[PDB]
Amino acid sequence: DFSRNLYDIGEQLDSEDLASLKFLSLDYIPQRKQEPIKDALMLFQRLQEKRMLEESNLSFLKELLFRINRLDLLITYLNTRKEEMERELQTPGRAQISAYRVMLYQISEEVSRSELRSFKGGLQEEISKCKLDDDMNLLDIFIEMEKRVILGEGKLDILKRVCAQINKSLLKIINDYEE
Amino acid sequence: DFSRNLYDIGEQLDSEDLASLKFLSLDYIPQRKQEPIKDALMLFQRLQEKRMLEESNLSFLKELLFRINRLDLLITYLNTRKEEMERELQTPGRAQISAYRVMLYQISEEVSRSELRSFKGGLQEEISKCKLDDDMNLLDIFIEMEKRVILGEGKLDILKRVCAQINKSLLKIINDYEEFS
Amino acid sequence: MSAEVIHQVEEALDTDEKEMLLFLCRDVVVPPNVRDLLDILRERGKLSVGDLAELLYRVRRFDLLKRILKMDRKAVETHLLRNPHLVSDYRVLMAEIGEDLDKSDVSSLIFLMKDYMGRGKISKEKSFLDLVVELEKLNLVAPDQLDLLEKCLKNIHRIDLKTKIQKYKQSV
Amino acid sequence: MSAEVIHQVEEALDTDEKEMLLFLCRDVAIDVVPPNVRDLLDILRERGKLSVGDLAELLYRVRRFDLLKRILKMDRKAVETHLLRNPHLVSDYRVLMAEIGEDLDKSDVSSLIFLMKDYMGRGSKEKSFLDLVVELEKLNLVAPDQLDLLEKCLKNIHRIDLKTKIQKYKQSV
Amino acid sequence: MSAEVIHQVEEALDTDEKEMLLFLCRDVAIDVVPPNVRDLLDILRERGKLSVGDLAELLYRVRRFDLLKRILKMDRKAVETHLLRNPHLVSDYRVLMAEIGEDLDKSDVSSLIFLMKDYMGRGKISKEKSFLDLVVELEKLNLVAPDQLDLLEKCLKNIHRIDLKTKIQKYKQSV
Amino acid sequence: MSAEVIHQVEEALDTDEKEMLLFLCRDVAIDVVPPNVRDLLDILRERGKLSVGDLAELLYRVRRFDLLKRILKMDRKAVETHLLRNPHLVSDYRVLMAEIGEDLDKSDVSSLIFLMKDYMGRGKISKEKSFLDLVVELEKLNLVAPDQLDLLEKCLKNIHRIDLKTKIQKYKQSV
Amino acid sequence: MSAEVIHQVEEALDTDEKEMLLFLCRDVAIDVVPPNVRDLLDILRERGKLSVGDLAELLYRVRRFDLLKRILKMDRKAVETHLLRNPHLVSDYRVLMAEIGEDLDKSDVSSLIFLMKDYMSKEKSFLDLVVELEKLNLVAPDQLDLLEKCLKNIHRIDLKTKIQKYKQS
Amino acid sequence: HMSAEVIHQVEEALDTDEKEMLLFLCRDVAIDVVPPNVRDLLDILRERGKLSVGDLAELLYRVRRFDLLKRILKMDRKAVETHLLRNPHLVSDYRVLMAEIGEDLDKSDVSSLIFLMKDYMGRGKISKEKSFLDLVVELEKLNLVAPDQLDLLEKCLKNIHRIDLKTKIQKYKQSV
């Protein structure tokens, strides 16, 4: 039953949703363990190995599904409404994902293709030249920035520069996260 | 041969017809399995694996071809008339596609490019900006609304709002589905 | 029968066909490799020309049926109609189901069957026949015990293989 | 022959040419399954069926004339005359199959696989044309005297030029 | 401790986790090279350095808490408190090396192997080997140690993994 | 019966078949421990418990049907009917143990030795023992018997050979 | 020469420059197929044909003088003088082929493939076409007539003039 | 001159590759015997007086086990280098050169070398699994490689495009 439910939830996630989940799980699943994850069941089993996903602890899975805006999966397979998740994640202590990760994902969801071109253009001097090809999305650029300690919870200056050069709502997201 | 016939039917379907076919089959083929489907033969094999497409079970294929208005393929390769299909689908229980899916596809068929642009403009506050790009058609917008449970069999109000702001016939289609449901 | 024929067959087969032959002959002492298996079948008297023909027919190597034993599909089919089978219909069904699953389908099958079994062994990459063997060792699959495999094949939307299972079940 | 020439030839070839050479040599060494091309050439040498002319023919069939000029110091017409006077290592059937495979993209291969699945069985499906021809040979579905099914399937996918290739082969035998 | 627990743990680990266990136990059993993980656990038990708490720590270092719950019937906080109260079986140097290894994909590992190949030959023939194999080959060459991390720091810098250099710097700042 | 038959059988068997025959006859020869197979056959004939049917049964248990056809001129049906009619020289317990030994590879045997060590220690020094050697070492320790199969059952369960546990239960249901 | 220099170069180059470097070095490593540029440079170094001047020439052919200044600490005139003194790793034929490939869009390459298919898959580049011709003994430093005629037939007469100027050298 | 405890430490601390290299390097000292394991070899060297602290230091230095040089013998690289500068060497520069060439070859190079040398030898003498040092040993038994006969190995290293190793061989030859 439980395994069939996890399999069915995995069958509803495409490669982009899977990339989103892997980015949201960077603070719990390291790079080496993340590399061979090509479907949702592998990430689910990696969470099971850390006991963050069991038949009596669906909290982190529900949080992951809520953060990627798959409310349909939450209501269908986990029997959870949007208001329930909103009330749960804003209670002190229950948030398992860091606000930094959520703000990075939200900024990635608000950047179109041309804005991504300009964002990649802005970072021409802080990333090696082969690692700035079209084959990367904004989350991979965020990961590569974190690897070079130019982006982080205390280092928002370069992100703020690029976003201010691009758009105002991104600066609003950054400043709303900061407070 | 059944496989040669399926190949010939596939050779007549372009990428847009394939997108329509995949949208109409969302209730039977999940997202993960649907992503790599880039031609008709892959969808046909996915259906064969679910036994919804066999040499003695052409029902779902004929329904798909009728719903995308490819009556030419039905009459030529499957030997099926328009009246036969409208009479079959009007028998209680024999329609394998849900009325919700058919209503979404038909309402998508009545929205032009400018109307689709206005539709994307209407959903500016409840859909992420990357999911409101020009590269998306109305069926993809329906999927993205379903992901945020603002569109569904029991939640038709937002679709009503946007369509009534756009066009009257869309609201008529919505309500005609809603009553006969 | 002679050792030359056994040598020809063993060297002509590839790795997958060898594994399938071993799995199919699991019913008839566990031979480590295929040549020893064929020698054991001959030494037990259970490898005449017709038995080797049946073995080549089950591994779908009709070219070897034509070059080595000088026979066609119709002759081996008549032999199977007249004489008892070396390979049971259960093994043929298992091989047939295994031939119709890619790596992703096998992984998804392993997840469900894992909750029902534990997946105590950790191999590099397990094939469907390896999974069926590990299930047999745990008494989870049998000619009269196909319900778990049937349910798991249903849940991954491989209803054609479920129909294969049901057609087998109706033949007894 | 010597191991130096074989080493040069094997490392100079690319993956597609290696697969093609293995497929072409499936007939000269039917009984065995060589894992790589270097071992295949060594087996051909120990079996006596790898003279300088045989290696020239093998390089000619994979259309690798640069190695014919650099390694064996031979030209196209020399290998063609050698094939004119001496017996061929690779039959025209294998050459025809490789030629048909050269003119098929991924979509054509997928459509051919779809049509052939009824004729072979559902049991991958991301293979090359030569892999399909090998699996058909194992299933006794294609042969030098049994080209009707492949001809029909190539006709049904609107590759009529390949049907004409098969017809010219049949008109050669 | 009993051979049943060792057998269960041995069956639960995969190849990467087995290699990590061997590397972590390289300090306790340094005179011998255990071929497999069952032999390693038998060696640790024969040396007396394998109580239930020691095996719990080993399972904690490989991040297999499900195994802590199923085999030893333990939780994360229990093992963490045990490590806070009792001495550690695996030194913090090994833990840092394992963390760095777990935070490197294949391309980063290959680039580190190349940069250090400038410093060492083809130590092990296999081109595709893990970060822990590289640190083992370096330890055998006396090139990396808890008190000599400058070379690993520079190589991690040259592959643009400054976060791992910061990890190493915090480790050195904890001494 | 004649000495030529015993000599032919002695020279025809190989090492594995000789060891299996000795193990199967371990119950009939309880006062004597025969080093080789000729001594066992001579003792069995001396005790009167080696007729043509008894040697046929012995050849059937070692799965040497060629010797049944060439030396004793018997078939599978003849030996099976003889076993159906007359009492067995080798008890079903020994035959069951040999069956279980036939269905274990090297890894399963090694895993059995580890846990049975948790209960028995090293025993013999060689890590190259067969399953029948392990069961003999257990019999010497009074740990396995026709009415004492629980430990072997649990150990076969722990190595995930549940089919062999079912074999043991099927044997126990034949009482 | 050291591995750190090869690393800095490989991380600095992009995909197009990597493919161009492989094609240019097809003459030195004329019997092996390097998968990536790190392996190509490693092979050149193990074969001794990758000194500081050789890597300088390689960076010069892709016109990456910024890397010549940052990694090898060289300027344009220094590398040009080194090429004036020492023999070249890449022949002028390869440089000409790369220069012609840089001045062809995808439609021109498709038309060249169409005309040349009579003499001989899609999504090919010009350098891939030149390689496939080299394997077929259809193009060489002393065999440019087919390429010249085909470049003329697609109304890229400037590239025919490039070939003429090379032939006059 | 050496105790059994030190020998025990060395045998169990070395791995299979290091043990094989030690046997290959000492093939010249113990001309008569093929020791099955390294402990028999080290004890035989002690019995023949060829295993002082400096001799074991040199042996550990050639197998590049500096961790054992420091843990077991409590010595530094400069100390063993000075000892080798001061006293005669147990392992000749030919063996050291062969070991270096073997250590600078990946699996493909070794397999290709075995293939090229197969023309000069038989088959069953060496299979695909053998290492470079096994190849050098089998060639030495056939007088195909030696301190005074490096032309074939030089040509084969040229044929596998390892010109740096050809330069190593030439540098060794220029020292004699």
Reduce the secondary structure of chain F to three states and give it as a string: CCHHHHHHHHHHCCHHHHHHHHHHCCCCCCCCCCCCHHHHHHHHHHCCCCCHHHHHHHHHHCCCHHHHHHCCCCCHHHHHHHHHHCCCCCCHHHHHHHHHHHCCCHHHHHHHHHHHHHHHCCCCCCCCCCHHHHHHHHHHCCCCECCECHHHHHHHHHCCCHHHHHHHHHHHCCC
Q: Do E142 and H15 touch (CB under 8 A)?
A: no
Residues 6+ apart with CB under 8 A from H103: E121, E122, E123, H64
Which residues in D lie closer than 8 A to residue B1 (C-beta atoms)? 115, 118
Instruction: Give the residue among G71, G51, G139 at the shortest CA–CA distance from G100.
Output: G139
Q: Which residues in chain G are contacts of H163 at CB distance < 8 A?
A: 46-48
Give the Cβ contact number of residue B132 at 10 Å.
Answer: 16
Contact predicate C121/C113, CB 8 Å = no
For residues C61 and C16, the answer to whether their CB atoms sit within 8 Å is no
Q: Is H161 in Cβ contact with G47 (below 8 Å)?
A: yes
Cα dihedral A110/A112/A114/A119 (nearest 10): 40
Tell me which H or E stretch contains A77: helix A71-77
Secondary structure (3-state) at D143: strand
Interchain CB distance below 8 Å, E158 and G7: yes
Asked if D78 and G150 count as a contact pair (C-beta separation under 8 A), the reply is no
Compute CA distances C50 → B3, C83, C92, H20, H128, whole Å.
35, 9, 17, 52, 38
Render the burial of D12-37: b for 16+ CB within 10 Å, e for the rest.
Answer: bbeeebbbbbbbbbbebeeeeebeeb
Full DSSP string of A163-178: HHHH-HHHHHHHHHHH
Q: Helix/strand/coil (H, E, C) string of chain B?
A: CHHHHHHHHHHCCCHHHHHHHHHHCCCCCCHHHHCCCCCHHHHHHHHHHCCCCECCECHHHHHHHHHCCCHHHHHHCCCCCHHHHHHHCCCCCCCCCCHHHHHHHHHHHCCCHHHHHHHHHHCCCCCCCHHHCCCCCHHHHHHHHHHCCCCCCCCCHHHHHHHHHHCHHHHHHHHHHHHCC
Residue in B22, B34, B38, B149 to test binding to A, most A beta-carbons within 10 Å: B149
Q: Distance (Å) from the C-alpha of residue C154 to the closest C-alpha of chain A?
A: 11
Distance CA C45, CA C62 (A): 23
CA A88 – CA E148 distance, rounded (Å): 47
Q: What's the Cα-to-Cα distance from G134 to each of B32, D79, E75, G68, rounded to whole Å?
A: 44, 18, 66, 31
Whole-angstrom distance, CA of residue H50 vs CA of residue H47: 8
Backbone angles phi, psi at G143, to 5 degrees: -145, 75
Residues of chain A neighbouring E66 (CB-CB closer than 8 A): 48-51
Residue H79 to residue A81: CA distance in whole angstroms: 73
Q: Which of A13, A75, A109 sits opposite B32 (nearest CB)?
A: A13
Q: Which residues pair with E148 in a beta bridge?
A: E145
Instruction: For H149, list phi and psi in degrees, rounded to 5.
Output: -145, 80
DSSP letter for each residue of H69-101: HHHTS---HHHHHHHHHHS--SS-HHHHHHHHH
Interruption sites in chain C after residues (C→N beyond 2.5 Å): 28
Amino acid at G90: V
* CA distance to partner chain F, nearest, from residue C66 (Å): 31
CB B85 within 8 A of CB B69: no
Token pair belonging to B133:
């790009």
Contacts with G, A 73-132, CB within 8 Å: 128-131
Which residue in D has a C-alpha nearest to residue H156's C-alpha? D4
Chain A contact for E102, CB < 8 A? yes
- Residues of B within 8 A of D159 (CB-CB) are none
* Spatial distance between the Cα atoms of F106 and A137, rounded to a whole number of angstroms: 50
CA distance G120 to G133: 8
C-alpha to C-alpha distances, H122 to D2, E133, H125, H127, H146, nearest whole angstrom: 14, 36, 6, 10, 19
Q: How far apart are CA H26 and CA H35, in angstroms?
A: 10
Identify residue A148 by its one-letter amino acid code: R
User: Across the strands, what pairs with A97?
Assistant: none
Identify the helix (H) or strand (E) that includes residue G2.
none
CB-CB neighbors (< 8 A) of F103 in chain C: 30
Residue among F66, F102, F163 minimizing CB distance to C137: F163
The residues that bridge with G143 in the sheet, in sequence order, are: G140
Taking an 8 Å cut-off on Cβ atoms, the answer to whether H65 and E140 are in contact is yes
Q: Who's near C167: CB < 8 A, 6+ residues apart?
A: none
Residue of B27, B32, B33, B125 to mutate, testing the A interface (most A Cβ within 10 Å of its Cβ): B32
Chain A residues with beta carbon closer than 8 angstroms to that of C155? 4, 7
| Structure tokens that stand for A146 in this block | 């974190």
Q: What does the block give as tokens for G42? A: 């490693």
DSSP state of G71: T
Q: With residue A120 as reference, give the H or E element that holds it.
A: helix A113-122
Taking CA F77 as the corner, what is the angle to CA F75 and CA F81, rounded to the nearest 5 degrees?
A: 120
Q: What is the CA radius of gyration of chain A?
A: 17
Contact between A27 and A97 (Cβ < 8 Å):
yes
Residue D87 DSSP symbol = P
C-alpha H24/C-alpha H99 separation (Å) is 9
Q: Between residues 142 and 171 of chain C, which touch chain A (CB distance below 8 Å)?
A: 155-156
- Inter-residue contact C12 to C64 (CB < 8 Å): yes
Calpha distance D7→H112 (Å, rounded): 7
Is C120 within 8 Å of E14 when comparing Cβ atoms?
no
Q: Between chains, do E122 and H105 touch, taking CB under 8 Å as contact? A: yes
* Count of residues in chain A: 179
Nearest CB to B129; choose among A40, A70, A110: A110
With CA atoms as reference, the chain C residue closest to E14 would be: C122
The set of chains that have 3 or more CB pairs under 8 A with F is C, E
Contact between A85 and A69 (Cβ < 8 Å)? no
Chains in contact with D, where contact means 3 or more Cβ–Cβ distances below 8 Å, are: B, C, G, H
Cα E46 versus chain centre, distance: 21
Which residues face G140 on adjacent strands? G143
- CB-CB contact of G132 with G120 (8 Å): yes
User: H/E element holding A17?
Assistant: helix A15-24
Q: Estimate to the nearest angstrom the gap between the alpha carbon of E20 and the chain centroid.
A: 5
Quote the CA–CA distance of H40 and E94 in Å, as a whole number: 34
Of the partner residues H66, H103, H106, the one whose CB lies closest to the CB of residue E142: H66
CA F45 to chain centre: 19
Residue G141 near residue G94, CB atoms below 8 Å:
no
Contacts of F113 in chain E (CB under 8 A): none
Residue F158: other Cβ atoms inside 10 A: 18
Residue B51 at interface with chain D, using a CB cutoff of 8 Å? no
* Chain-chain contact of H162 with G43 (C-beta, under 8 angstroms): no
Tokens 């000088």 belong to which residue?
Answer: C70
Q: How far is CA H97 from CA A1, E17, H166, H170, in A?
A: 64, 37, 11, 11
Q: In this complex, do D118 and B39 lie within 8 Å of one another by their Cβ atoms?
A: no
Distance between first and last Cα of chain F: 33
Which residues have a Cβ under 8 Å from the Cβ of F56 and sit 6 or more positions away? F68, F72, F74, F78, F79, F82
- Whole-angstrom CA distances from A177 to A147, A149, A156 are 21, 19, 11
Angle of helix B40-49 versus helix B59-67 axis, rounded to 10:
140
Q: Which residues of chain F have a CB within 8 Å of the CB of C44?
A: 65
Cβ-based neighbours of G45, under 8 Å, separated by 6 or more: G1, G6
Query: What b/e string do you get for E7-18 counting C-beta neighbours within 10 Å, with b at 16 or more?
Result: bbbbbbbeeebb
Phi, psi (deg, nearest 5) at residue B135: -75, 5
Q: How far is G156 from chain H (nearest CA, A)?
A: 41
Which candidate from F65, F102, F160 shows the least CB-CB separation from C138? F160
For chain C, the residues whose C-beta falls within 8 A of a C-beta of chain F are 29-30, 43-45, 120-121, 134, 136-139
Residue owning tokens 């591994």: C59
- Nearest residue of C to residue F64, measured between CA atoms: C44
Q: What is the DSSP string of chain C?
A: --HHHHHHHHHHS-HHHHHHHHHHTT-----SSHHHHHHHHHHTT---HHHHHHHHHHTT-HHHHHHTS---HHHHHHHHHHS--SS-HHHHHHHHHHTT--HHHHHHHHHHHHHHH------SS--HHHHHHHHHHTT--BTTB-HHHHHHHHHTT-HHHHHHHHHHHHT-
Which residue, among A42, A49, A153, would best test binding to E if mutated, counting the most E CBs under 10 Å from its CB? A49
Verify whether the Cβ–Cβ distance D111 to B4 is below 8 Å.
no
Asked if the Cβ–Cβ distance from C121 to F65 is below 8 Å, we say no
Cα Dmax for chain A: 52
Greatest alpha-carbon span in chain C: 48
Chain breaks in chain B (C to N over 2.5 A) after: none
Helix (H) or strand (E) holding E5: helix E3-12
Chains that touch A (3 or more CB pairs under 8 A): B, C, E, G
Contacts of H39 (CB under 8 A, 6+ apart): H7, H8, H11
What are the chain A neighbours of C114 within 8 Å (beta carbons)? 3
Tokens of residue F94, six digits:
């020994």
How many residues would you count in chain F? 175
User: Are B128 and A109 within 8 A, CB to CB?
Assistant: yes
Quick one: which of A75, A73, A57 has its CA closest to A10?
A73
Q: How many helices (H) and strands (E) does chain H have?
A: 11, 0
Distance CA A120, CA D7 (A): 46
From the CA of E143, how many Å to the nearest CA of chain H? 9
3-class secondary-structure state, position E161: coil
For the purposes of burial, counting CB atoms within 10 Å of the CB of A100, is it exposed (0-12), middle (13-18) or buried (19 or more)? middle
Cα separation of G72 and G70, whole Å? 6
All residues at 6 or more sequence positions from D117 whose CB lies less than 8 Å from its CB, including other chains? B3
**Touch criterion met for E and H (3+ Cβ pairs within 8 Å):** yes
How far apart, in whole angstroms, are the C-alpha atoms of residue E168 and residue G127?
Answer: 46
Residues facing residue C166 across a β-bridge: none
Q: How far apart are CA C57 and CA E87, in angstroms?
A: 65
Task: Give me A67's structure tokens.
Answer: 């953060």
| Phi, psi dihedrals of residue B16, rounded to the nearest 5° | -70, -45
Which experimental method was this entry solved with? X-ray
G7 with E115: Cβ contact below 8 A? yes
Q: C57-75 b/e with 16+ CB inside 10 Å = b?
A: bbbbbbbbbeebbebeeee
- Quote the crossing angle between the two packed helices E106-117 and E131-140, to the nearest 10°: 20
Q: Which of F103, F161, F166 shows the shortest C-beta gap to C30? A: F103
Residue with tokens 């030959």: E121
The answer to whether E122 contacts H106, with C-beta atoms less than 8 Å apart, is yes
